[PDB]
């Protein structure tokens, strides 16, 4: 208890609001103590004085700032009256606006993990009997060495599965009895685990493992051995070291503990919460167990948090705890609401608000995309830490604006994180990454939609500033998507790019608002044909070539190879034209002005031959397997002539060049003359055969990468896994977020505003046949738009077999 950190603050409420477990590492040995904590409420006495004084004096006005849209009401037992003292008399319990923070949370926010009971021996003895009240005891102390030195463990990893193998395994520091030809493979991994244990002893220095790993092969067939055998084993382990160990529980679901095991392991708990090939998983997990123990030690040494922080995104918990500490240093109310993803905005958070609902589903990030052919050398520079740099440089009435005081608090917090990351601090940079990945997390214990909307808008404006800076630098932008930028440098020569690129990136780095922004060139494009993210091609470093054409999937299998082959032919045509133009010399008019002529005669000759071939085999069977239009998620266009679709696609890709527009139009007209179709005919006009269905603000649960996952245009390989890494994604998460966007669109359509059909004045009343100017009322979101969205969702669900999405579609009608 004396300068002793509790490893676990597990809720030993026992029905008492303030009684809880404190397993403080006392000087001799860890000791379990009870506490007593009043529940402070932030109900500021806004221009109204209540002399009621039910149980505890309430601070007037709380000396704090409320939430626009040192402990008042320090009551001990809120359960005295659930109605409390509701008056609604000028903000006296009229709007709660306090703290729902129960025990185990108010303590962490107020009392540091390491604490010393500064009382005499008699007072300490008195407090031992009933507990340590936070009002007069448990003052925070410094966390120079918050963790311990050498403590026993209770490693009980478990990896259940439905195949038929049970992984109810238990590990002891000295027993080494792992109760589940496993020894041979265990030694196979031990071959490198000697080096791993050397790393542990030179870096962790916490625990050591016996080398005589004996494997007990017992079939946990039924609960007699699944739980009861495990229950007796765990109580034997508990009595072996009486309250002298830390349980290391690994289980995808924790209920097994809470039934009977949790109280059988009242010693401090850490919940990791993570056939012959599957046997290797057990040995890898047991032999990697001594690696993250020192990581947790470092985390609890730096962050003033106990060892009870739940391991599933524990860094989010660290963010919430640290921000709560910093906000308690300030005199500002909180919006914790641990129970619900909503913030604790009093009682007003449970009713519908137009602005709040709109800022919930406001994730449309502007994209800059320019379709064309650019003989100039264009650089693909990938940005990173854009959100971090944005929140750092944000320093450089409005009901939609977040609390600027909390904004400054977050800015200082991020500043200290950043300049700790500059020096040796892995916790700091992990924390800044987690804050980047954390603002948009509803599960956050301090999440606020207004804060997320503010951060999104700030990132938008920072990207706009970066685009303006690059434009002023002398490199036009053809792509910008918050994750990468394509800059069209005017330097024609591929050789004269490296020095120019270095000068450009130095000039960008000189900008104060982008000093923390980091960038790196991904690829150099002497030649590039660009439409969108998923439909492009060209030469990258000048020697490599890439071709990512999703529209090729929309063509018949007979004509897809023809599409690809003629695409490389035309690419070589523009490459030769650019080379000749540069050789002669060394947009209104660029290096490409007659590249079509390199293939004009071959192109239309091959088109005529393919037209005759198709006309011969359009109706004759056994060729329809070739003249078949493949079905894609974005399929919304009916193709009567696969050859016509092919030629329209080629015409659209070769129309990208602005300088050769006339010659490309002439070639298209000549090609259409083969079909005897007019040049400007509507059927002759090409349109995108693929729709789009993006999932905004998709986050990779491993590398914390923010992306927007398309499905009607993005390839299936690009949707089930991340980009920067190659880790996969959860099907359940994909379906959840797709249904989330679907229901959000449905609600937005149902909550839209009306406006006039003639002067476009927004409808502002409720009873009106039309606008006073005789203009019919109309919604901003058309019903046809929602119909198309529902059709796209149904097509995606059917194509990818999304069961829950199909269930949602069935629920709709």
């Amino acid at each position: 208890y004396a300068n002793s950190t509790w490893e676990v603050l597990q809720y030993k409420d026992s029905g008492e609001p303030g009684v809880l477990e404190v397993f403080v590492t006392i000087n001799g040995k860890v000791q379990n103590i009870t506490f007593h904590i009043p529940k402070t409420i932030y109900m500021k006495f806004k221009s109204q004085t209540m002399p009621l004084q039910k149980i505890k004096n309430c601070l007037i006005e709380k000396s704090s700032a409320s939430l626009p849209n040192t402990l008042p009401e320090s009551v001990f037992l809120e359960e005295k009256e659930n109605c409390t003292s509701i008056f609604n008399d000028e903000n006296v319990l009229g709007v709660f606006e306090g703290t729902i923070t129960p025990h185990q949370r108010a303590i962490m926010d107020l009392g540091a993990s390491v604490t010393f009971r500064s009382k005499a021996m008699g007072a300490l003895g008195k407090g031992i009997q009933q507990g340590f009240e936070m009002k007069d005891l448990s003052m925070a102390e410094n966390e120079r060495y918050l963790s311990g030195f050498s403590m026993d463990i209770g490693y009980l990893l478990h990896f259940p599965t439905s195949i038929g193998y049970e992984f109810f395994s238990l590990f002891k520091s000295w027993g080494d009895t792992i109760t589940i030809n496993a020894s041979s493979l265990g030694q196979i991994y031990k071959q490198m685990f000697e080096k791993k244990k050397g790393k542990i002893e030179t870096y962790s220095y916490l625990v050591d493992i016996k080398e005589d790993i004996n494997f007990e092969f017992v079939y946990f067939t039924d609960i007699s051995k699944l739980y009861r055998r495990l229950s007796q084993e765990t109580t034997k382990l508990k009595e072996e070291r009486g309250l002298q160990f830390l349980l290391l529980l690994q289980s995808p679901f924790i209920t097994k503990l809470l039934g009977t095991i949790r109280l059988l392991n009242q010693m401090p708990i850490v919940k990791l919460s993570l056939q012959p090939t599957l046997l290797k998983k057990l040995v890898n997990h047991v032999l990697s167990s001594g690696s993250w123990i020192s990581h947790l030690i470092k985390l609890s040494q730096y962050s003033n948090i106990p060892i009870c922080n739940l391991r599933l995104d524990s860094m989010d918990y660290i963010i919430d705890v640290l921000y709560a500490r910093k906000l308690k240093k300030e005199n500002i109310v909180l919006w914790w609401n641990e129970k619900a993803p909503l913030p604790d905005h009093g009682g007003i958070q449970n009713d519908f608000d137009l602005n709040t609902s709109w800022i919930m589903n406001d994730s449309e990030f502007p994209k800059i995309n320019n379709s064309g052919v650019y003989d100039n050398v264009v650089l693909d520079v990938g940005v990173d830490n854009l959100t971090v740099n944005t929140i750092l440089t944000s320093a450089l009435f409005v009901h939609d604006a977040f609390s600027n005081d909390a904004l400054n608090v977050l800015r200082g917090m991020l500043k200290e994180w950043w300049d700790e990351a500059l020096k040796e601090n892995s916790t700091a940079d992990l924390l800044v990454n987690s804050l980047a990945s954390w603002v948009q997390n509803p599960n956050a214990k301090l999440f606020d939609g207004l804060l997320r909307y503010h951060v999104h808008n700030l990132t938008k404006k920072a990207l706009l500033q970066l685009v303006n800076e690059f434009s002023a630098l002398g490199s036009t932008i053809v792509y910008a998507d918050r994750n990468q930028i394509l800059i069209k440098t005017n330097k024609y020569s591929p050789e004269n790019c490296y020095a120019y690129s270095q000068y450009m990136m130095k000039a960008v780095r000189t900008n104060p608002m982008f000093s923390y922004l980091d960038l790196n060139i991904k690829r150099y494009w002497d030649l590039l044909i660009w439409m969108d993210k998923f439909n492009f091609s060209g030469l990258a470093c000048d020697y490599t070539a890439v071709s990512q054409w999703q529209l090729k999937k929309f063509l018949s299998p007979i004509y897809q190879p023809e599409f690809e082959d003629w695409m490389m032919i035309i690419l070589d045509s523009m490459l030769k034209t650019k080379q000749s133009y540069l050789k002669l010399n060394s947009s209104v008019e660029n290096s490409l002005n007659g590249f079509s002529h390199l293939f004009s005669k071959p192109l239309m000759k091959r088109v005529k031959k393919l037209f005759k071939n198709q006309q011969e085999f359009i109706l004759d069977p056994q060729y329809e397997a070739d003249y078949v239009i493949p079905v894609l998620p974005g399929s919304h266009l009916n193709v009567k002539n696969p050859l016509l679709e092919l030629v329209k696609s080629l015409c659209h890709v070769m129309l990208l060049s602005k300088s050769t527009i006339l010659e490309i139009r002439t070639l298209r007209k000549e090609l259409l003359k083969i079909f005897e179709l007019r040049e400007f005919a509507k059927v002759a006009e090409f349109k995108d055969p693929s729709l789009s269905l993006v999932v905004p603000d998709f986050l990779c649960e491993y590398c914390f990468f923010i992306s927007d996952i398309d499905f009607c245009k993005a390839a299936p390989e690009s949707i089930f896994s991340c980009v920067r890494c190659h880790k996969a994604f959860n099907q359940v998460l994909l379906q959840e977020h797709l249904i989330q966007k679907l229901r959000s669109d449905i609600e937005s359509y149902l909550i839209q505003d009306l406006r006039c059909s003639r002067c476009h004045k927004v409808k502002r009343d409720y009873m009106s046949a039309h606008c006073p100017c005789a203009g019919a009322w109309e919604g901003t979101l058309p019903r046809e738009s929602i119909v198309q969205k529902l059709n796209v969702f149904k097509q995606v669900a059917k194509y990818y077999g999304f069961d829950i999405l199909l269930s949602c579609i069935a629920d709709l009608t």
Binding site: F352, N443, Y702, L733, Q740, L750, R783, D803, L812, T813
Partner: protein
């Protein structure tokens, strides 16, 4: 009763001579063949079926009222109706009547589209995947219809009880300082001052020096009856007295609508009197499947009710402690999977009691913490016409039992001639927060809330900016008939049961008040209710 098959050609002369000649009924070949088969089955030698055909035609003319009875459904319908009339008289059937044929539950998408013609009529209106989406005109008229219904209630009740009339807002312009009474939807303008909206127009009101009725809750979005003096100088209505429109009895609406038949009404009354012993058990609010103490209490209650399974067992909203949403994690947090496992655990803990859930229909009501209604609202008051719980989570629950219904949050039941409306919502908190003050205990507050709810004639007399509503599915929330039994489930209001204007309102409250798993019981035959508090 001798079974036989008779061919259409021989019965055709007599069948024609009866149906077509006697009363003008067109007979088709398929209908003739099916009727011949039926006649042969229910009589041998096909001689004395003349009474049967006469009964068929008379019932068809009295009920169907069209021609071409040979469509396999007019024939089958008249045959079945003859079956029930023979059964109640106590052939093909001589059994007794069953309430299951007269008991039904109506979802928000299964109600009758009742659009009230503004002059004098309450008409009936009754296509693809996106065929349920409400149209812009529906958003326009979702409050037009509410205004018209409340106006009908006013012009039927107030004038006959109290007789200075309602002056349209548009007709208040040229009058300088006269006295006026307006029935208008109270709201706050975009300028931020109080006013009343009306199809004729809107008038800004001087809310000062106004004395309202103290037995009502007044909020933005509810339509009130203000009275005062208009001023053209400020173009403002200085209001002095204000009240909610007076309510009306259920039978007053029934006599206006004129919707029942006489035989059906007599059968329903006979079943109401005979079915004296039928128990309806209502569970509390917020049955959190995540809370272990809640499963302990629910196991105790399920065991207690397994002794005597009631007629119905309704389940109220917010079945989980945390609102559902798209949860990002690599573990089993996955609120969809967690909610499905919660229903699976409920099914496992509920299949243990065979006597329960048999001869008993259990209905589930969505809430602020339910899938497809909370996954975007995030535990806030989202769309009011909440859709039923998706079947993707109800595989094991429905597999356990045989009569499980997942119904809308404001659902309707036609168990008898009486209609029972179920509604789970914390209306008390919204009313208290949004109640506007006047510059001018618990039972009194509940009386005020119920009086506001009934007098307004709407389940949630609130602005769509305060609680979104499906535009087409608004008649589901209108209290047009004022049905007798209101299942007004709430969590921020104390448990109570009160009657007024011939309507019964029950608020069982939250499932756990302090330490007890409170649930409610109702007997429709006696129309008598009783609380059930069971300690944990």
């Amino acid at each position: 009763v001798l079974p036989v098959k008779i061919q259409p050609p021989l019965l055709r002369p007599l069948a024609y001579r009866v149906l077509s000649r006697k009363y003008g009924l067109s007979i088709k070949s398929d209908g003739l063949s099916a009727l011949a088969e039926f006649v042969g089955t229910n009589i041998g030698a096909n001689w004395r079926q003349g009474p049967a055909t006469i009964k068929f035609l008379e019932q068809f003319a009295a009920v169907w009222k069209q021609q071409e009875r040979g469509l396999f459904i007019d024939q089958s319908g008249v045959k079945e109706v003859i079956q029930e009339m023979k059964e109640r008289e106590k052939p093909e059937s001589s059994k007794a009547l069953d309430w299951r044929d007269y008991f039904k539950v109506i979802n928000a998408s299964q109600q009758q589209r009742f659009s009230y013609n503004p002059h004098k009529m309450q008409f009936i209106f009754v296509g693809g995947i996106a065929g349920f989406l409400p149209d812009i005109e529906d958003k326009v008229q979702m409050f037009l219809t509410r205004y018209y219904l409340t106006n009908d209630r006013v012009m039927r009740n107030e004038n006959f009880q109290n007789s200075m009339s309602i002056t349209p807002i548009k007709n208040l312009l040229g009058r300088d300082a006269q006295n006026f009474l307006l029935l208008g939807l109270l709201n706050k303008n975009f300028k931020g001052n109080w006013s009343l909206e009306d199809p004729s127009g809107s008038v800004e009101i001087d809310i000062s020096q106004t004395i309202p009725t103290q037995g009502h809750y007044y909020v933005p979005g509810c339509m009130v009856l203000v009275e005062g003096i208009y001023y053209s100088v400020g173009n403002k209505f200085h209001v002095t007295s204000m009240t909610l429109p007076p309510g009306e009895r259920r039978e007053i609406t029934l006599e206006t609508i004129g919707n029942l038949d006489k035989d059906l009404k007599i059968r329903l009354h006979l079943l109401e009197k005979e079915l004296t012993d039928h128990k309806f058990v209502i569970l509390g609010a917020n049955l959190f499947l995540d809370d272990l103490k809640i499963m302990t209490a629910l196991s105790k209650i399920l065991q207690k009710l397994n002794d005597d399974p009631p007629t119905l067992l309704i389940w109220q909203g917010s079945f989980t402690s945390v609102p559902v949403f798209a949860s990002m994690s690599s573990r089993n947090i996955s609120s969809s999977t967690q909610f499905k496992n919660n229903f699976d655990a409920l099914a496992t803990l509920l299949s243990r009691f065979d006597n329960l859930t048999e001869n008993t229909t259990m209905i589930f009501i969505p809430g602020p913490n339910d899938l497809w209604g909370s996954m975007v609202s995030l535990g806030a008051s989202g769309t009011l016409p909440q859709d039923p719980i998706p079947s993707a989570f109800t595989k094991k629950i429905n597999k356990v039992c045989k009569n499980v219904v997942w119904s809308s949050n404001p659902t309707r039941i036609a168990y008898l001639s009486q209609e029972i409306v179920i509604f789970r919502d914390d209306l008390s908190g919204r009313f208290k927060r949004h109640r506007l003050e006047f510059p001018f205990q618990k039972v009194q507050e509940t009386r005020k809330l119920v009086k506001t709810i009934l007098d307004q004639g709407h389940l949630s007399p609130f602005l769509d900016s305060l609680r979104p509503i499906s535009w087409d599915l608004d008649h589901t929330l209108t209290l047009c008939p004022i049905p007798s039994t209101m299942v007004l489930c709430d969590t921020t209001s104390a448990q109570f049961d009160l009657t007024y204007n011939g309507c019964k309102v029950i608020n069982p409250g939250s499932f756990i008040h302090n330490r007890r798993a409170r649930y409610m019981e109702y007997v429709p035959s006696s129309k008598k209710t009783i609380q059930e508090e069971i300690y944990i």
